[PDB]
Amino acid sequence: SSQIRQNYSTDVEAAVNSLVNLYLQASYTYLSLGFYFDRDDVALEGVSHFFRELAEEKREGYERLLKMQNQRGGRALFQDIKKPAEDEWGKTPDAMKAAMALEKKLNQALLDLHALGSARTDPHLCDFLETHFLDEEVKLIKKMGDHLTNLHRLGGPEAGLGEYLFERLTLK
Amino acid sequence: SSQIRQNYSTDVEAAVNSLVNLYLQASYTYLSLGFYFDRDDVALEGVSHFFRELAEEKREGYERLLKMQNQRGGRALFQDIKKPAEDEWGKTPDAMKAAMALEKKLNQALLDLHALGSARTDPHLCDFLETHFLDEEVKLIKKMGDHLTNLHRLGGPEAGLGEYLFERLTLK
Amino acid sequence: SSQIRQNYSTDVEAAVNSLVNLYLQASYTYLSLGFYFDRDDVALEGVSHFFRELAEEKREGYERLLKMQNQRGGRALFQDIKKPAEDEWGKTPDAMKAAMALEKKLNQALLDLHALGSARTDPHLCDFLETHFLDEEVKLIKKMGDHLTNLHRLGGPEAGLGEYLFERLTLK
Amino acid sequence: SSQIRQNYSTDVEAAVNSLVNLYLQASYTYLSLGFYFDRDDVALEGVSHFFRELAEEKREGYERLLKMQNQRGGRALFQDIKKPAEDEWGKTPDAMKAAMALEKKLNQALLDLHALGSARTDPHLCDFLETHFLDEEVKLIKKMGDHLTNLHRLGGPEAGLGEYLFERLTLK
């Protein structure tokens, strides 16, 4: 057992380890996306660089979750980071839909974890998620929402020109 | 009666005065440990300086609590700050156990107060404790938990050398 | 297939993706180690920080590998990241042996990949691994070897005392 | 013959002189493209500037080759630099396909020369090409591959407009 187990339940601990696996699948998916958009047959350095940053944000994510779990004295435990859903992410809007769907899944897992944390009454977990996960997701999901709307706006028979202008002018 | 006071229930107000008294007992206890580890027959200036910092932190604790009590229009009511649980804190590990147990008890009182804040529906109390209490306690109980683990790693037939190397190389 | 892909054979590409998966298992293992050594019953900030930097450096490893595979016109693809071997890593020498074994396994995969690149006549792959992998692992396996020797010079009948000194003084 | 000559085979000298002539054809080709894209009826100062830089990097190439050949006691037997394959290079993608075909042929000559370096046991030649030719051509062939994919993703009824946007937003 652990001497720092002040009010941190075994099912919240199991949920936080499940959340860490989710944030790891997210970092690994944004790694796959980040390098996919740098393949020569895709060649969108800015779309790449955006998902390179999201892999890093999700990496600060699982590092904060593990840091927090050790702060609560929980057992960190690890199971397979199952592979990113596609090895062929397709056009920028397709990949941005996949990124959006991944982040909405991830935010759902955080909202579910806060629902659990408030149900068990674990105020430090509520604070932690509130402080730098729930707002991290909401800002980032809004940013991907703006990107999706701009990619739908730029959609048409000239969609290739759309993706280039999206990348150069929005994604630096 | 207060003219500014809103939502802030009488049981929360009394529990905040109770938390102030607990944070004062804690501060006074860390004053006792802080000067105990500076006694000539104990002589662990780093262990002293650590508990001196905790007395300062638990002082910022009751000061933040009382500033908040006033901001909510609560009467700050001052009860006796009872004598610390010992004045012979003994070996560094046994003193650190007493600190750990005090700090866990203080965190438990904050969680009881947050649970009361939730049960009275007071968001600003919940925010205030989440902002700069529950974070402090979990970081500090973790820091004591690490100190205890290192002291239990160092404890043995050479325990006095263990206490010294802990005080020198962990506690500056 | 790719417009840029020159000389980069199918078995080089398969081996490089296998190396990316190996480096991902390595980062994930140094993550588990890094957070295990931060765990309250383990409490070794410098050992945690050492494996945190190895998770970081193995992350530069797979990111450099993927960057290179893209620069060679490979189709980077992703298997599951298999979990770290066992998460109760034992005492620091037991964990440092698990790290050494993992690192020698990883360096073996680099040497196998360079031998494969030499057997397929891929000079650029030979250069890339020479440039900032083979040196990178040899320096690091030397550093792990130094740490193992120190943890076997220490860590006899004084056991835990030697482990603490090793963390404080060797690992900052 | 030469008092410093060691392991530098007459085959390696003949191949290095052939590579120097080929890097001179490459710089001379990128001179023709560089000034063709500066031409009033073409007017793409970014595409011009891009090929002006490639002519410069291919010059740093043949100079560094000659500097090395003197470093190894070979004789710099120069040959006629044939005119580039066109001067009416056409649209930017169709010119840059020729830039790719040139650079991949230049990279093939490096790989042939490195294969000869291994087949004559010249570790210093192998290192020299590995150090600052092979990885340049790989990074450069990647960069052209990215530019071609962007240009094909900008080729269609939006041609010309996509060619200008490519210049304006990539080559600036």
Side-chain angles (χ1 to χ4, degrees):
Chain A
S1 191
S2 158
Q3 51 262 294
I4 156 70
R5 299 298 290 248
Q6 255 281 285
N7 189 51
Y8 182 73
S9 67
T10 54
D11 49 1
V12 165
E13 172 177 34
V16 170
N17 284 293
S18 305
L19 214 312
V20 163
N21 187 279
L22 246 297
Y23 257 75
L24 287 161
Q25 286 186 52
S27 283
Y28 191 26
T29 300
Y30 293 127
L31 180 72
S32 175
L33 284 163
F35 283 103
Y36 182 86
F37 282 90
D38 175 58
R39 288 163 52 155
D40 68 305
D41 58 1
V42 186
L44 288 172
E45 306 81 75
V47 178
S48 169
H49 189 261
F50 175 68
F51 297 131
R52 302 247 62 247
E53 289 184 343
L54 302 202
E56 195 77 336
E57 288 276 38
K58 297 302 89 163
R59 174 154 50 216
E60 289 203 28
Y62 63 77
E63 289 183 18
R64 285 173 204 162
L65 278 157
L66 290 171
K67 195 78 195 83
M68 178 283 297
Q69 179 147 243
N70 283 357
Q71 238 81 323
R72 306 307 300 287
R75 303 306 79 176
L77 72 94
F78 296 102
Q79 72 298 81
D80 302 347
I81 310 163
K82 68 195 302 176
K83 51 86 84 286
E86 304 298 343
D87 303 270
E88 279 292 346
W89 295 105
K91 307 297 89 78
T92 311
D94 313 333
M96 198 67 67
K97 284 180 183 180
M100 172 60 75
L102 166 63
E103 219 69 351
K104 285 180 66 181
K105 184 196 299 183
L106 196 68
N107 188 42
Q108 192 59 47
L110 289 164
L111 291 161
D112 296 347
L113 180 64
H114 186 290
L116 178 64
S118 64
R120 298 296 177 269
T121 309
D122 298 30
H124 179 286
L125 181 60
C126 292
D127 172 65
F128 169 80
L129 298 176
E130 285 182 26
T131 294
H132 51 192
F133 285 76
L134 289 158
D135 201 52
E136 188 255 310
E137 297 292 57
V138 163
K139 287 180 299 209
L140 178 50
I141 285 169
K142 171 61 163 64
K143 182 161 55 178
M144 281 191 262
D146 296 345
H147 299 332
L148 277 172
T149 291
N150 281 308
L151 290 163
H152 300 317
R153 161 180 290 118
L154 289 163
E158 72 277 68
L161 166 64
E163 294 181 76
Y164 176 70
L165 289 173
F166 172 73
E167 189 259 43
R168 285 294 185 242
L169 306 179
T170 279
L171 304 187
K172 305 81 52 67
Chain B
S1 56
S2 170
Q3 64 187 339
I4 118 282
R5 178 179 187 153
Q6 179 170 23
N7 197 84
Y8 194 71
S9 63
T10 53
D11 51 359
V12 159
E13 172 185 22
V16 168
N17 287 323
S18 305
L19 252 295
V20 164
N21 184 272
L22 256 291
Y23 257 90
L24 287 157
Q25 287 183 44
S27 304
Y28 190 38
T29 299
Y30 293 123
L31 186 71
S32 174
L33 280 85
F35 283 100
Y36 184 85
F37 285 97
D38 174 56
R39 289 165 51 159
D40 66 302
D41 57 359
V42 182
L44 287 161
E45 294 90 285
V47 181
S48 173
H49 188 258
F50 173 72
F51 294 124
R52 300 246 60 237
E53 288 187 45
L54 304 202
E56 176 79 328
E57 185 183 289
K58 300 309 87 162
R59 160 169 49 255
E60 293 189 10
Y62 60 71
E63 287 199 324
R64 285 179 228 133
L65 275 160
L66 285 163
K67 189 167 62 178
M68 184 281 289
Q69 180 80 300
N70 275 357
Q71 283 174 350
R72 304 307 298 286
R75 308 302 85 170
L77 297 183
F78 298 101
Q79 306 305 338
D80 298 334
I81 309 159
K82 69 194 301 179
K83 167 164 54 254
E86 252 302 346
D87 275 334
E88 283 294 342
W89 300 108
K91 301 281 80 75
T92 312
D94 289 345
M96 197 69 69
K97 292 170 197 164
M100 185 78 164
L102 166 61
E103 211 70 0
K104 286 168 62 178
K105 184 180 297 182
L106 192 63
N107 184 84
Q108 182 65 61
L110 287 163
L111 291 174
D112 300 343
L113 179 64
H114 186 295
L116 183 64
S118 302
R120 296 302 96 89
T121 311
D122 198 281
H124 176 267
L125 174 64
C126 299
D127 171 53
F128 165 84
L129 301 179
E130 285 180 45
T131 293
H132 49 204
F133 286 79
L134 297 172
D135 178 70
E136 111 179 356
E137 296 299 75
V138 167
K139 277 151 56 179
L140 183 46
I141 298 163
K142 178 56 164 64
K143 185 160 53 178
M144 290 182 187
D146 293 345
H147 297 335
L148 277 166
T149 288
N150 281 300
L151 288 165
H152 285 300
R153 203 206 310 292
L154 287 163
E158 69 290 85
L161 169 147
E163 291 185 276
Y164 176 76
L165 287 172
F166 174 72
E167 181 270 359
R168 287 291 94 184
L169 304 177
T170 288
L171 301 185
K172 306 95 61 174
Chain C
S1 56
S2 162
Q3 67 222 298
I4 61 163
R5 186 182 185 147
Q6 180 172 17
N7 171 265
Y8 195 79
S9 69
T10 187
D11 48 351
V12 159
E13 176 178 40
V16 168
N17 287 291
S18 306
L19 258 296
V20 165
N21 187 270
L22 253 296
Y23 267 81
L24 289 158
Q25 291 183 40
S27 283
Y28 194 25
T29 300
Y30 297 126
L31 185 75
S32 171
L33 287 159
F35 283 94
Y36 170 92
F37 282 101
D38 179 55
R39 205 174 73 180
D40 70 307
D41 63 307
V42 187
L44 285 159
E45 293 93 303
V47 183
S48 174
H49 183 258
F50 173 72
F51 295 127
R52 293 256 54 235
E53 288 190 334
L54 304 203
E56 193 92 332
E57 173 269 5
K58 297 306 176 233
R59 171 272 240 70
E60 287 195 47
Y62 62 75
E63 291 190 9
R64 286 170 196 173
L65 275 160
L66 288 165
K67 168 278 202 189
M68 172 278 287
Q69 180 174 182
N70 280 2
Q71 283 181 344
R72 295 301 298 288
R75 306 297 70 144
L77 57 75
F78 298 97
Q79 273 58 254
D80 299 343
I81 309 165
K82 190 57 47 68
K83 67 172 265 60
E86 284 301 344
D87 303 284
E88 296 305 317
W89 295 103
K91 305 301 85 175
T92 309
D94 310 328
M96 196 67 65
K97 285 180 185 178
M100 188 75 160
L102 168 63
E103 211 79 318
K104 287 181 66 180
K105 180 179 298 185
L106 190 67
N107 185 46
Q108 192 58 51
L110 295 180
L111 291 163
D112 298 344
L113 177 67
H114 185 292
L116 184 150
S118 302
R120 294 304 91 91
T121 312
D122 193 324
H124 173 274
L125 179 64
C126 299
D127 173 60
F128 167 79
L129 299 176
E130 290 164 12
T131 291
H132 58 183
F133 283 79
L134 288 162
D135 175 57
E136 212 86 292
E137 298 309 327
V138 163
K139 292 174 307 196
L140 183 47
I141 297 173
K142 169 60 163 70
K143 184 160 55 176
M144 288 189 185
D146 295 338
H147 296 337
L148 285 173
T149 289
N150 282 292
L151 289 168
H152 296 314
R153 166 160 47 240
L154 301 161
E158 23 55 65
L161 162 63
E163 170 174 78
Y164 170 83
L165 284 174
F166 171 79
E167 179 273 331
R168 288 286 80 209
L169 298 173
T170 334
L171 309 186
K172 311 161 271 70
Chain D
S1 56
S2 165
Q3 69 203 340
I4 65 158
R5 196 182 192 118
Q6 187 166 24
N7 276 45
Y8 203 75
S9 176
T10 51
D11 301 351
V12 166
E13 168 181 303
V16 167
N17 286 321
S18 304
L19 260 293
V20 164
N21 177 271
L22 192 65
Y23 269 75
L24 286 157
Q25 293 179 42
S27 283
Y28 192 34
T29 300
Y30 296 131
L31 183 72
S32 172
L33 278 89
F35 282 91
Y36 169 84
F37 282 104
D38 176 72
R39 208 170 83 182
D40 41 282
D41 58 339
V42 188
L44 290 173
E45 53 86 333
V47 181
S48 173
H49 176 239
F50 174 78
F51 292 123
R52 296 270 294 119
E53 288 188 345
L54 302 202
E56 203 100 296
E57 288 188 358
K58 295 315 86 157
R59 175 159 91 275
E60 293 291 355
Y62 61 74
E63 290 185 19
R64 185 160 62 235
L65 273 158
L66 287 161
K67 200 276 297 189
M68 176 279 287
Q69 181 159 234
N70 284 353
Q71 226 113 73
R72 294 298 299 294
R75 307 294 66 142
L77 193 292
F78 289 99
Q79 287 297 353
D80 305 290
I81 308 160
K82 63 160 290 184
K83 65 188 266 64
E86 251 298 352
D87 287 319
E88 298 305 316
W89 297 101
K91 295 295 92 78
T92 306
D94 299 328
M96 194 165 290
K97 288 169 197 167
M100 270 276 286
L102 169 58
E103 217 71 343
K104 289 175 64 182
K105 179 257 290 287
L106 196 67
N107 187 44
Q108 188 59 43
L110 296 181
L111 293 169
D112 295 347
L113 176 65
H114 188 292
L116 181 66
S118 76
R120 298 296 175 270
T121 311
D122 192 335
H124 172 269
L125 177 69
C126 289
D127 174 65
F128 168 80
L129 300 178
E130 285 171 343
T131 296
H132 45 207
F133 290 80
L134 287 164
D135 194 62
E136 181 194 305
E137 301 313 336
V138 163
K139 290 179 302 215
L140 180 46
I141 286 165
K142 172 64 158 70
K143 181 163 57 176
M144 292 187 183
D146 296 335
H147 298 340
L148 281 190
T149 289
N150 280 293
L151 286 168
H152 299 160
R153 186 156 39 53
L154 291 165
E158 82 299 343
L161 174 142
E163 180 180 52
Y164 170 81
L165 284 170
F166 171 68
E167 192 264 51
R168 284 292 96 181
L169 302 177
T170 299
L171 307 183
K172 207 75 66 242

